[PDB]
Amino acid sequence: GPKFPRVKNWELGSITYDTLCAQSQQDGPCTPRRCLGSLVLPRKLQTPPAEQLLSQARDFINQYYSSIKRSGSQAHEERLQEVEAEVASTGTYHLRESELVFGAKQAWRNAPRCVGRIQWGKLQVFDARDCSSAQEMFTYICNHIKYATNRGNLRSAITVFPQRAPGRGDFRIWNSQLVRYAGYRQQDGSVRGDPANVEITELCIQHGWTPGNGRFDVLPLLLQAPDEAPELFVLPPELVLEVPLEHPTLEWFAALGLRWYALPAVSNMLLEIGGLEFSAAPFSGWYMSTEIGTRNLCDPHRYNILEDVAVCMDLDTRTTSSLWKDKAAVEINLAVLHSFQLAKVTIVDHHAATVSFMKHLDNEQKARGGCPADWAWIVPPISGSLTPVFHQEMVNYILSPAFRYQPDPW
Amino acid sequence: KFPRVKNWELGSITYDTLCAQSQQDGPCTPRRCLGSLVLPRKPAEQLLSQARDFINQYYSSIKRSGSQAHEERLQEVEAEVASTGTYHLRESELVFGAKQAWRNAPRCVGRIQWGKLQVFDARDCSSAQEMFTYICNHIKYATNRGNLRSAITVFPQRAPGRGDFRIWNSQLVRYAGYRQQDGSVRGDPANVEITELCIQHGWTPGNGRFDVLPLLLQAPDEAPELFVLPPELVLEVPLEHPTLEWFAALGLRWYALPAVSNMLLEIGGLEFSAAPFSGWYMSTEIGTRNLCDPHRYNILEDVAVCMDLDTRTTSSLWKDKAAVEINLAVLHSFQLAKVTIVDHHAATVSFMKHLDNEQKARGGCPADWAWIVPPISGSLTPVFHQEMVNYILSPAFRYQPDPW
Numbered sequence: 076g077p078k079f080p081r082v083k084n085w086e087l088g089s090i091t092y093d094t095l096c097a098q099s100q101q102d103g104p105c106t107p108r109r110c111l112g113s114l115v116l117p118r119k120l121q122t123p124p125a126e127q128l129l130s131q132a133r134d135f136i137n138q139y140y141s142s143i144k145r146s147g148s149q150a151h152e153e154r155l156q157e158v159e160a161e162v163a164s165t166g167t168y169h170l171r172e173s174e175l176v177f178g179a180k181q182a183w184r185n186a187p188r189c190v191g192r193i194q195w196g197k198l199q200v201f202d203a204r205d206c207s208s209a210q211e212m213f214t215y216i217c218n219h220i221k222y223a224t225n226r227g228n229l230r231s232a233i234t235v236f237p238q239r240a241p242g243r244g245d246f247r248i249w250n251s252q253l254v255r256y257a258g259y260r261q262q263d264g265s266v267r268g269d270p271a272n273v274e275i276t277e278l279c280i281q282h283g284w285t286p287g288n289g290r291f292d293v294l295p296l297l298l299q300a301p302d303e304a305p306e307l308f309v310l311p312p313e314l315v316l317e318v319p320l321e322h323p324t325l326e327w328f329a330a331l332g333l334r335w336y337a338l339p340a341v342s343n344m345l346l347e348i349g350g351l352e353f354s355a356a357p358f359s360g361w362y363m364s365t366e367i368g369t370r371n372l373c374d375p376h377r378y379n380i381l382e383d384v385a386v387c388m389d390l391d392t393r394t395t396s397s398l399w400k401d402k403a404a405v406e407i408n409l410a411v412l413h414s415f416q417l418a419k420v421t422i423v424d425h426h427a428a429t430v431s432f433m434k435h436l437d438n439e440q441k442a443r444g445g446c447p448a449d450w451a452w453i454v455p456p457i458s459g460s461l462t463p464v465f466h467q468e469m470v471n472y473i474l475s476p477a478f479r480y481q482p483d484p485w
Numbered sequence: 486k487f488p489r490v491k492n493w494e495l496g497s498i499t500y501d502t503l504c505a506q507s508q509q510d511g512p513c514t515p516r517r518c519l520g521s522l523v524l525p526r527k528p529a530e531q532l533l534s535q536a537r538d539f540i541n542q543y544y545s546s547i548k549r550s551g552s553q554a555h556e557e558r559l560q561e562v563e564a565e566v567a568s569t570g571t572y573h574l575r576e577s578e579l580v581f582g583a584k585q586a587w588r589n590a591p592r593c594v595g596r597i598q599w600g601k602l603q604v605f606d607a608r609d610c611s612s613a614q615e616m617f618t619y620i621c622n623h624i625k626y627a628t629n630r631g632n633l634r635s636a637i638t639v640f641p642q643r644a645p646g647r648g649d650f651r652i653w654n655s656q657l658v659r660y661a662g663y664r665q666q667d668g669s670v671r672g673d674p675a676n677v678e679i680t681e682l683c684i685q686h687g688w689t690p691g692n693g694r695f696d697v698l699p700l701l702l703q704a705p706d707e708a709p710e711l712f713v714l715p716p717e718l719v720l721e722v723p724l725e726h727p728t729l730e731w732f733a734a735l736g737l738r739w740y741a742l743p744a745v746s747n748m749l750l751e752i753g754g755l756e757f758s759a760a761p762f763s764g765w766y767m768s769t770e771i772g773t774r775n776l777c778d779p780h781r782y783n784i785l786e787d788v789a790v791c792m793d794l795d796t797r798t799t800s801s802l803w804k805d806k807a808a809v810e811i812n813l814a815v816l817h818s819f820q821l822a823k824v825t826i827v828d829h830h831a832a833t834v835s836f837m838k839h840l841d842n843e844q845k846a847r848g849g850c851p852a853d854w855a856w857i858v859p860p861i862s863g864s865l866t867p868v869f870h871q872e873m874v875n876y877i878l879s880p881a882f883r884y885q886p887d888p889w
């Protein structure tokens with residue numbers, strides 16, 4: 076019937092149409108000839124003339140005034156005029172605090188790869204647009220961590236540092252997350268710690284950090300204020316909450332000495348709002364257990380502990396058909412959940428998370444006529460079809476405000 | 486441009502140039518990606534261009550391009566289309582086309598096997614009764630007492646202004662699904678509609694959870710006819726678990742032969758509306774989807790209860806634990822019965838080898854990531870970490886509407 080993508084849920088047999096994708100102003104990587112939906116970072120996902128800026132600005136101001144039900148109002152028209160003026164005189168413009176708050180939330184709401192978006196309306200937005208030094212960025216980040224960690228009762232938050240400005244250096248956090256374990260390349264070619272972090276680890280060393288030699292050394296932050304060499308800051312150990320991993324029934328699991336940090340705080344993404352670019356805007360939520368238990372601990376190119384655990388479980392690792400990988404992976408995920416619960420640190424299992432995302436989809440269908448969703452990222456890395464999202468068709472597209480990938484500062 | 490394609494586990498990069506040979510649009514646009522949708526939303530110069538392209542593919546394959554034979558064959562095809570509006574394939578072209586369609590199937594993880602396919606030419610078939618005879622022989626050959634062999638049987642092509650040959654069943658072997666007026670379904674809920682069609686065509690139904698359906702076979706412009714399969718033709722595996730003795734008590738079983746029968750085979754513009762094909766199962770199809778899907782047999786909770794798992798909460802991972810034991814039981818039972826099956830680790834490992842073979846051979850491989858990655862233990866398999874490019878090449882297997 077309708078001229079919009081028809082979306083089907085194969086478990087429930089129910090049908091929706093996505094009308095929200097018509098609001099997309101930015102092209103993704105796919106064409107009628109070939110789909111590139113499985114690519115992590117296609118060129119059409121990597122990242123001004125006042126005409127371009129103003130149209131993006133006017134679109135955002137329209138979104139804002141819609142969200143507060145004042146579209147067409149005199150205040151709506153005046154805000155528009157005021158933005159056009161700023162841009163005419165300065166080349167850029169500035170967001171009111173309530174527009175920044177709305178924009179940050181909408182960027183999270185818009186993120187197709189995030190399964191946690193049921194929470195989108197509950198985001199504490201810290202305005203750090205007054206920050207003027209790397210030391211001050213550090214102070215702001217520490218406050219973020221303390222507020223967000225909240226002794227294990229985690230709270231979603233974002234801290235927004237000053238926007239990109241014409242002919243001035245960017246504010247940048249070099250680290251990809253506020254909390255990351257070191258990866259030390261060994262003289263034999265292997266890696267001690269997290270192989271994901273070899274590059275940032277070496278950068279920290281080049282910039283003066285004295286490296287340790289454990290599997291779980293917390294990295295210092297490399298913080299860059301405009302037109303300045305990045306500076307090195309060590310997080311006070313007591314600010315970094317970690318959870319030692321144990322298993323509810325396998326007593327030997329604790330002896331493995333595994334652990335993970337409580338706070339997933341992503342720090343290298345660009346926050347874009349109405350054409351304005353916030354190159355430093357770290358945000359944090361809480362973990363879904365599979366991120367830790369499946370990806371971080373079991374990816375072959377990460378900690379890669381699957382075989383070690385399988386051996387402790389006395390499984391047959393010389394043959395695929397024993398499903399030793401599947402058995403070990405399940406017990407590792409269970410250990411993560413059990414350990415976080417025991418430590419009273421917020422965590423969500425992949426079943427609870429995907430059920431809540433289905434509720435989010437229903438909410439958004441009514442509120443906006445759709446929800447951009449990247450199926451490959453939404454479906455968890457273990458037990459895929461055991462979760463409701465597997466059976467849900469999704470439509471993926473780019474809406475703004477958006478969190479976007481940005482090239483590394485070096 | 487042509488896409489850069491990365492493997493995140495290995496760091497290796499390829500470029501897919503094969504996608505440039507696609508002459509068929511998928512569902513995505515720059516505005517929105519529809520890569521996770523199961524089904525697509527919806528004359529003479531056209532036919533001739535598809536035909537010439539396929540004939541060119543065929544002679545290129547046998548290292549005889551530009552030969553006198555190649556040039557004459559194109560003339561045959563053109564003469565036929567210009568005079569009759571259609572044309573006909575030689576057996577050897579049909580054999581080549583059936584193999585290429587499998588090779589080109591973006592959703593199939595078993596494509597390492599693509600060059601090994603027994604092709605039965607059933608184009609001399611004029612009746613539903615004859616279709617049945619061919620189908621029985623297909624099943625007999627492919628089953629091979631448990632040493633499964635891939636096969637396809639090709640019934641006559643669609644023709645202008647004449648109804649199609651069709652097999653109404655979605656697979657040659659399916660279990661009945663009986664709708665209870667108390668909402669529920671007994672058997673396989675995926676098969677309620679086909680079960681009801683069989684009944685109204687005069688099938689006397691059973692009332693079990695694993696009653697094998699009769700076939701409904703249709704010759705052009707005729708009501709379909711009902712044919713019960715001889716039970717000795719249908720190999721089934723009773724399911725037991727290597728250590729959990731109670732599992733056998735569940736009374737579960739599955740059939741050996743996965744034989745998809747409702748897809749359309751397109752070769753050189755020609756369409757084969759009945760062309761059932763079969764391989765062997767990957768264990769997750771049975772253990773995970775068929776048995777654990779909420780809208781299928783849905784046995785997770787039953788198994789979880791017997792394992793004495795805490796069902797009160799998701800965070801006990803009862804679902805994950807039960808699914809793993811169910812997949813293991815399928816693997817164990819098929820192995821015990823000497824019936825061919827491949828686990829999802831072995832299968833995805835073979836597919837990565839296939840990807841490498843195809844990169845060298847054709848400069849890429851169309852793959853549908855959402856279907857290639859197995860439905861349990863995704864990131865535990867190498868295909869999870871492999872970027873893939875999805876596109877439609879011809880010869881192709883396609884969906885077609887149900888004949889009712």
Ligand code: HEM
Nearest residue numbers: 183186188189190191194231232358359360361362363478
């Ligand atoms: C509140 C609890 C949250 C949960 C359970 C959650 C869950 C997840 C998960 C599992 C992923 C996939 C991560 C991966 O595999 O690397 C993800 C991605 C993402 N999340 Fe959420 N998230 C939460 C909060 C937030 C917040 C507060 C923001 C921003 C304000 C956010 C923005 C994003 C973005 C932009 C991505 C995609 C990142 C990328 O493309 O690399 N999330 N989330």
Ligand code: HEM
Nearest residue numbers: 587590592593594595598635636762763764765766767882
């Ligand atoms: C030889 C062993 C084979 C294995 C292990 C295998 C494996 C698989 C699996 C696991 C799927 C996903 C199906 C689903 O989830 O429902 C699939 C799909 C598919 N396979 Fe294969 N396959 C084999 C043989 C074949 C053969 C012989 C053909 C055709 C000649 C074929 C053509 C296809 C097609 C067209 C699909 C997609 C069907 C659809 O979209 O519903 N496969 N295969």
Ligand SMILES: CN(C)Cc1cccc(NCc2ccc3ccc(N)nc3c2)c1
Nearest residue numbers: 251252339341342343344360361362363
């Ligand atoms: C590479 N950058 C995008 C930063 C980075 C580093 C390491 C992992 C990830 N994952 C993306 C991501 C983004 C936001 C998240 C929010 C909550 C959460 N639990 N995981 C989340 C995961 C992101």
Ligand SMILES: CN(C)Cc1cccc(NCc2ccc3ccc(N)nc3c2)c1
Nearest residue numbers: 655656743745746747748764765766767
């Ligand atoms: C819905 N129709 C496309 C037919 C149908 C009915 C029931 C199941 C499936 N699954 C698709 C399918 C196709 C080919 C396969 C080949 C081998 C295999 N092991 N499974 C395979 C599965 C397909």
Ligand SMILES: C[C@H](O)[C@H](O)[C@H]1CNc2nc(N)[nH]c(=O)c2N1
Nearest residue numbers: 113114115451452869870871872
């Ligand atoms: C190649 C593939 O796109 C890649 O491995 C993706 C798949 N899905 C994912 N899903 C999530 N949530 N996070 C990831 O990092 C990835 N990686």
Ligand SMILES: C[C@H](O)[C@H](O)[C@H]1CNc2nc(N)[nH]c(=O)c2N1
Nearest residue numbers: 465466467468521522523855856
């Ligand atoms: C909605 C989603 O596309 C649908 O559930 C897909 C996902 N991936 C799949 N993968 C395989 N192998 N088989 C399937 O039927 C499906 N179904």
Ligand SMILES: [Zn+2]
Nearest residue numbers: 105110513518
């Ligand atoms: Zn796409």
